[PDB]
């Protein structure tokens, strides 16, 4: 069984920001879930660049990626995001959400192995058909915020059907923020109409998993994905007040 | 050969804080070292809590520590450091420099295996006299700031004579700070008279290793270990201005 609690008080965080969406938290020690909206918590959306987490694991598991230091040379095509127009390793490809590096991984994996692996990870509901380098925003594939949490819990515990090394590498590449109070390992995601933030907050005595998604009519309020999540984390006393 | 540069301009950082000591930096890409004082950079001191880095590696390698989640229960003895009066895992034992946890690791490792391993690591003067649970607290073990750097470089590259997994785990336990500009993996050290900060700063395109120590007449200016290092890192444009 899974314990869930609907906390509509968190709605004020989306409302004060003229936004709509869902924040889902999971308290690992207590085996208890929390969300502002249980309906939307279970609504499946395209993962967008949150798909960089399973893609990284699969690439590492198959040897497409040797380790976190291997260099993926820039193909020489000048794109709008300046940080993409250069060489990268797994750490920086993840940090700058370098889509062409990940399109190349997906093509090397191929749709037969990508499909088998996603079924092994029990990752959303997939229907890839001649779109290996775009299914994460096609889509192609859809995943809910509660399903993002089940997948992340497996990753955190090294329980996915890949080596412990591959899972450790991806968790290192997911490193977003750390200080004396907490460690955040996460992945942002954006594709027309939906923005995501998924990952976890490691504390000394507990791990709080999180998955949020929000309506993004334009690419304007990308900062709200982390800001809204942090407002919920602060309300719940998971992270300190700045 | 090893390239060193003495930059006496960094002395103003120790000066302005009514302190004395050394900051040693190593630019990995350029294979170039930098220091305010070459004499003190090579002066050997008690490693104190920086010894938690090889102690962790050896415990993991021998199976004394199964993984970063294994719990070392508090024995119920009330000690001066409030954070020691609780259960720890490898992450929190390192963060809070929990001496009783590490004394237990050392006893399990034993004298013979501790000595062989420190020689395999080329760790300082490689002297474990006298007691296996206190030689780093008040024994004959000595390490210089440049020797801390040689050891840390090996750890960073997974080049120490332990498994890749053990080195990955210790580097995770060393996680101190991370943001969009840099990642710091380090270990503080304090024992009467000397304070240490050793580790590295990971950037997108380089790694800067660091080892500092300073005179600590009392346990008052512990914050200066990190503050002085960061002033040097900011002067050298390694990390941005806050």
Residue numbers in the entry:
A (entry chain B), B (entry chain A): 22 to 214, 219 to 267
Passage from the reporting paper:
One of the main carbapenemases is the class D β-lactamase OXA-48, which represents a major public health threat because of its rapid spread worldwide. Although OXA-48 hydrolyzes penicillins at high level, it hydrolyzes carbapenems at a low level and shows very weak activity against expanded-spectrum cephalosporins. OXA-405 is a peculiar OXA-48-like enzyme, as it has lost carbapenem activities and gained expanded-spectrum cephalosporin hydrolytic activity subsequent to a 4 amino-acid (AA) deletion in the β5–β6 loop. Kinetic parameters confirmed that OXA-405 behaves more like an ESBL ß-lactamase, rather than a carbapenemase.
The crystal structure of OXA-405 refined at 2.26 Å presents the typical class D fold with an α-helical region and a mixed α-helix/β-sheet region, with 96% of all residues inside the favored regions of the Ramachandran plot, 4% in the allowed regions, and no outliers. The asymmetric unit contains two protein chains, A and B, modeled with 246 residues each. The crystal structure of OXA-405 showed that the 213-TRIE-217 deletion did not modify the overall structure of the protein but resulted in an important decrease of the size of the β5–β6 loop, with important consequences on the overall shape of the binding site. Clear electron density is observed for both backbones and side chains, including the active site and the β5–β6 loop, with the exception of side chains of Lys218 (OXA-48 numbering) from the β5–β6 loop and of Met22 (not shown). The Lys218 is flexible, as shown by the reduced electron density observed on this side chain. In contrast, the R2 substituent of cephalosporins has unfavorable steric clashes with Arg214 in OXA-48 that are not observed in OXA-405, where this residue is absent and the β5–β6 loop is shorter. These structural differences explain the systematically lower Km values of cephalosporins in the complex with OXA-405 compared with those of OXA-48. OXA-405 features a more open conformation of the active site due to the absence of Arg214 and its stabilizing interaction with Asp159, as well as the smaller size of the β5–β6 loop. This leads to an increased affinity for cephalosporins and a decreased stabilization of carbapenems in the active site, thus explaining the important differences in affinity for these substrates observed between OXA-48 and OXA-405. Our results confirm, that the four AA deletion in the β5–β6 loop observed in OXA-405 is responsible for a drastic loss of carbapenemase activity, particularly for imipenem, and a gain of cephalosporinase activity with the ability to hydrolyze cefotaxime and ceftazidime.
